[model samples]
Target: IVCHTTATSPISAVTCPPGENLCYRKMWCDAFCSSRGKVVELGCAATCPSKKPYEEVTCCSTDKCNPHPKQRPG
Candidate 1:
């Protein structure tokens, strides 16, 4: 079970890389965009439960809080 958290659009914000499964508990913001007043926190682990074939997962955040790849989209 892969996990994903997303904010606003899949672009602009960070997205999960391909071939990596998501955790079921991934958190996503209700709003599309994040403002200075509003803060969003997303947690991620290197491993997850399980996944199906060809499943796509995504995570997003404005700032670089957690460990992630430098590239925007992968």
Candidate 2:
């Protein structure tokens, strides 16, 4: 599996260690800056498992799918 951020950012390919899976996540904040963000992960049990200040969170199971979208969803 491969992990990447912001599409234009560097990509990191990794192999699942023992019990893990490839995960992708994208989120955006509403208050305080109100900007979108993304996070990609590989060799993990799941995507980020913590609550953020984002308005929404999106997940996927593909390489580089965590890239920040062209526009924030509404």
Candidate 3:
């Protein structure tokens, strides 16, 4: 599984670990969405991470679906 990871190093679109079938991205902010809070961290994930009421962790099974932190329900 290949996924894009990190923002500082945009050249991080690479493969994941063995048997990995999902790519995940996380977006969080400080003080209830104040200021974008460092915006990043999307990579190959086999299992989805924990949940948070103040943040979002989106997992994708398609190719390069973790391009950004935009999770639209449309």
Winner by lDDT between candidate 3 and candidate 1: 3
The residue ranges of model 3 lying beyond 4 angstroms of the native Cα positions read 5-11, 28-38, 69-74
Worst 10 residues of 3 by lDDT: 2-11
Q: What TM-score would each prediction reach against the true structure?
A: 0.20, 0.37, 0.49
| Candidate 2 per-residue lDDT over residues 1-74, each given as its tens digit | 53444322333444222224434343434335445443322223345443343554454455534544444344
After superposition, candidate 2 runs with Cα above 4 Å error: 6-21, 33-54, 69-74
The root-mean-square deviation over C-alpha atoms between each candidate and the true structure, in angstroms, is: 11.7, 7.1, 6.6
Worst 10 residues of 1 by lDDT: 35-44
- What tens digits encode model 3's per-residue C-alpha lDDT throughout 4-59? 44322243556344336555555544247765454555544445453444465666
Top candidate, metric TM-score? 3
C-alpha lDDT of all candidate models, in order: 0.32, 0.40, 0.49
Candidate that beats the other on TM-score, 1 or 2, i.e. the better one: 2
User: Considering only N, C-alpha and C atoms within 3 Å, which residue pairs clash in candidate 1?
Assistant: 1-50, 2-22, 2-23, 3-22, 3-23, 8-32
For model 2, state the Cα shift of residue 51 in Å: 6.8
Quote the lDDT for 57 in model 2: 49
State the lDDT at 61 in candidate 3. 57
